Write a protein that binds this ligand. Structure first.
Ligand code: MG
Lengths: 120, 239, 106
């Protein structure tokens, strides 16, 4: 569920409607100045809230994926997702810390199927 | 409700929290809704004293709300504030005016509209003690079923509309500023057409939904207090 | 008989596991060392006679459509999708256009 929320936020951030909304403000900025700066100030708040929400969802998804991998063997394939979230978000400090602390406890054989993709 | 908040008080409180965090907006909206209770159920009571006529008028009102909500969602109707919707005194049916904003252009607005239609507390209170459950949900499902069964014809009609040279349906900064004031075209047309196609096929977030599931999602989005707290104060989501 | 039913079973399993398959292909397509895209040199070598992110996203979305049963914008059941694939594969019109090295007549 956390991964679904994070993917929804990511898709909205990369949606064409988001691009249209962002480009409308850039076109409009080019009385008048007061409302223009009002818009260019409110969009920053909206973007910051969206980014923080995405970070929270991503961290929760990664932590719960690690916990699921540590608690059984029925859902081993989901390690792919755990790597996909980790590789695409290497800059995030929380994901790296979670992989270093609890990801190390995961049995290593579960990482075997994607040993190529990690090695590259 | 003489002892509740006045509409002026709610409007002032809502404007004060506009330039604040989303959590503060949500808590202020919840506090306002606590001291502002819907009273629309009294519209049919005071006008139709006969119980049979009262029941018929309430049923007609609920059916009109359901049909208008589904059709407006299909067409992406926006700017559904309290002054843009009229109610017939004789028949209790809703009429939608000021149809300038459509095809989800209201989502492009500075304060985006986060609801597919207006389903605030007063609108639901006008439906009776059962609320959205019963007549409203079933009628919404029927209207969505008809919309889905006629997706080809509807898509063709909207295609004919969107490429009309004299149809100025796209949102521009001047229109957006006039809508919310305080004291390539082919690409956009194709995107709107594809979004309408997804709506008509029941695809919402990339997942195919049944008529009932899509109706449930729309109702949940419309009645969500979190979405209502973010809306422009002129929309009057608390009313 | 056996072929169509087994195709339907395999497509049902593929559809039931669309999330896992999509995740695996996502992990594949962004491998830096995986040279899966077509280039003119490879295309010429294949048939000789005497932005990367955009392409990856397009391929992923096409795979998603295949896994959800959407072929030409219309949602198809497992049986309908299997029928469409078999009809496309056995169509003589498609086979006549293919490269002679493919040997569509064999
Ligand atoms: Mg008006």
């Amino acid at each position: 569920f956390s991964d679904t929320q994070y993917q929804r936020i990511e898709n909205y951030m990369k949606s064409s409607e988001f691009e249209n909304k962002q480009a409308l403000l850039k076109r409009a900025k080019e009385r008048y100045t007061v409302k223009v700066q009002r818009e260019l100030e409110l969009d920053e708040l909206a973007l910051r809230a969206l980014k923080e929400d995405r970070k929270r969802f991503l961290c929760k998804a990664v932590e719960n994926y690690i916990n699921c991998l540590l608690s059984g063997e029925e859902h081993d394939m989901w390690v792919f997702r755990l790597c996909s979230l980790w590789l695409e978000n290497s800059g995030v400090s929380e994901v790296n810390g979670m992989m270093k602390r609890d990801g190390m406890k995961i049995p290593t054989y579960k990482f075997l199927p994607l040993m190529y993709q990690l090695a590259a | 409700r003489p002892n509740d908040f006045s509409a002026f008080q709610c409007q002032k409180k809502m404007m004060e929290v506009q330039k604040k965090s989303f959590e503060e907006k949500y808590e202020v909206f919840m506090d306002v809704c606590q001291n502002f209770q819907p009273v629309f159920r009294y519209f049919c009571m005071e006008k139709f004293l006969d119980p049979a006529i009262w029941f018929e008028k309430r049923l007609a009102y609920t059916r009109s709300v359901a049909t208008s909500s589904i059709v407006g969602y299909i067409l992406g109707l926006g700017d559904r504030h309290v002054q843009n919707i009229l109610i017939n005194e004789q028949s209790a049916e809703l009429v939608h005016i000021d149809l300038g904003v459509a095809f989800e252009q209201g989502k492009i607005l500075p304060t985006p509209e986060t609801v597919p239609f207006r389903l605030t507390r007063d609108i639901v209170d006008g439906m009776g003690i059962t609320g959205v459950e019963g007549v409203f949900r079933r009628c919404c499902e029927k209207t969505m079923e008809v919309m889905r069964n006629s997706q080809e014809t509807l898509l063709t009609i909207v295609e004919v509309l969107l490429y009309d040279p004299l149809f100025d349906w796209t949102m521009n900064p001047l229109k957006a500023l006039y809508l919310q004031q305080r004291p390539s075209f082919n690409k956009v047309a194709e995107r709107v057409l594809m979004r309408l196609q997804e709506k008509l096929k029941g695809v919402e977030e990339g997942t195919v939904l049944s008529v009932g599931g899509q109706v449930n999602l729309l109702i949940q989005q419309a009645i969500d207090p979190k979405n209502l707290s973010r809306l422009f104060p002129g929309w009057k989501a608390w009313v």
